[PDB]
């Protein structure tokens, strides 16, 4: 029971599967698409201190990954290199075949130390971390991501109607993910 949205003549209605209204035509698996949308486009604050408050560490929950075929250009991506005060890794290395988000104008690369009190870092509002055509529930080390969400569509029969430079800004942080956190941008 996941909302499947069907595009009508230049309009979008969420197709109700319980009833059966046949005027929708799905003649091939090519009409089915998944799309990732950026949270930025909904007006959330993009400042680094505001953004980092949305993430938190937790133990006991296995991570999960789901693919998507088409995405949005991101204005802001993030890249985290956080260590414990003794010097240890609190973010796991990227698994094989998880690369960074392809298109973002700005990559905020944050380095520093924190308590990292949990096995994995999750999104406190339940959104996803988008990478190159894979969305994960957790943050991987040294891998640029965008915040986003996934939708599923039945595209119309006609193909035609539907479907580069980067900059890095560096920060040093102490007390990352805590009530009072110290940032210095270089």
């Amino acid at each position, epitope marked *: 029971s996941i909302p499947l949205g069907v595009i009508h003549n230049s309009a979008l209605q969420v197709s109700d599967v319980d009833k059966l209204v046949c005027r929708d035509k799905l003649s091939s698996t090519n009409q089915l698409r998944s799309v990732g949308l950026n949270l930025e486009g909904n007006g959330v604050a993009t400042d680094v201190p505001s953004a980092t408050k949305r993430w938190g560490f937790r133990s006991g929950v296995p991570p999960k990954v789901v693919n998507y075929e088409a995405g949005e250009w991101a204005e802001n991506c993030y890249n985290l290199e956080i260590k414990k005060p003794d*010097g240890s890794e609190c973010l796991p290395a990227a698994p094989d075949g998880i690369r960074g988000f392809p298109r973002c104008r700005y990559v905020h690369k944050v380095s520093g130390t924190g308590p990292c009190a949990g096995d994995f870092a999750f999104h406190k509002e339940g959104a996803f971390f988008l990478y190159d055509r894979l969305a994960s529930t957790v943050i991987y080390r040294g891998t640029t991501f965008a915040e986003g969400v996934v939708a599923f569509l039945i595209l119309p029969q006609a193909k035609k109607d539907f479907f580069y430079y980067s900059t890095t800004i560096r920060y040093q942080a102490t*007390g990352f993910g*805590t009530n009072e956190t110290e940032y210095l941008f270089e």
Partner: antibody
Amino acid sequence: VQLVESGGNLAKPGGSLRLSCAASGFTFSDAWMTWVRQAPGKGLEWVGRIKSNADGGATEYAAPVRGRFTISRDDSRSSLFLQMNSLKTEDTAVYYCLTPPPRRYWGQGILVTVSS
Amino acid sequence: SVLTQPPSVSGAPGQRVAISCTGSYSNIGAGYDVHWYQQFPGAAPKLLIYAYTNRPAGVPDRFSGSKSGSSASLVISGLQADDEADYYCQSYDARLRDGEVFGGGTKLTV
């Protein structure tokens, strides 16, 4: 894992003394290193810490000792150096150089007695 | 922003004792590890409990620990003559630029 600390002794007020620590049996380059000073017959204290070269090799110091003590390291020599300058009164203590937890393995200790 | 322990504790041989180390919201209750150390007179301290409850190889199983709220407690059961030592708790403060904090220390007597 053997840590030996050397080259330290009493210094006059306003003096500069340099201490050194030699580490063996483990890879010095990766590990973060810290310096602790214990007052004679009193509780432990933290002098400061030096990060790895890979992480930028930044150093941080305690609030009392900030601006008077310098921490450094040499990967090839596998040695850690502490530079004490402008040594005033109440700096007397045993100094130790300790590895990153787990297996902290504190060294033996160098006694520094400022004499007036 | 200094962790505080009791000046001294005592107990008869064979019983169990617990040593307390008080914390703060930005110290222990912020989620930083607490380390314990044992110092014999005239010697450098040795690691006792590297994490909140972990033990490095070679430490007898008489020593354990637990965290409650913003405070940590070291539990030692079965006092022997050899347990006389100075115990210190250590943690990382988050309001002090992630600088190490050392407890006042506790002397043990049997």
